[PDB]
Amino acid sequence: SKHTPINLVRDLPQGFSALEPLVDLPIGINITRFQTLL
Amino acid sequence: PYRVVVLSFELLHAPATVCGPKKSTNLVKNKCVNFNFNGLTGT
């Protein structure tokens, strides 16, 4: 994960940023699809 | 009567979570030592 401030609209910001690890969970289950919650 | 409690040992094909503790000894400095930091073995 990574967070960054932006003052832009309707476009992916131009820049470079790295995503640090957050938590490792070894559930050991198979996954094929996903969907967010909103 | 004689109450009986049985602990079951199960090892399925998946990453493990709970198991025996590992003792971490003292931390020495300024000496040649064979060390082991969370599984990383070296000298």
Side-chain angles (χ1 to χ4, degrees), chain A residues 17-22 24-32 34-36:
Chain A
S17 178
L19 270 68
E20 297 80 2
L22 201 63
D24 179 15
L25 303 181
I27 309 102
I29 53 161
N30 301 339
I31 293 177
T32 289
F34 64 92
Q35 163 151 9
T36 179

Side-chain angles (χ1 to χ4, degrees), chain A residues 3-22:
Chain A
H3 303 324
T4 187
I6 49 175
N7 198 354
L8 283 76
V9 285
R10 301 292 296 164
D11 186 65
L12 266 173
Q14 291 318 317
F16 193 80
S17 178
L19 270 68
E20 297 80 2
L22 201 63

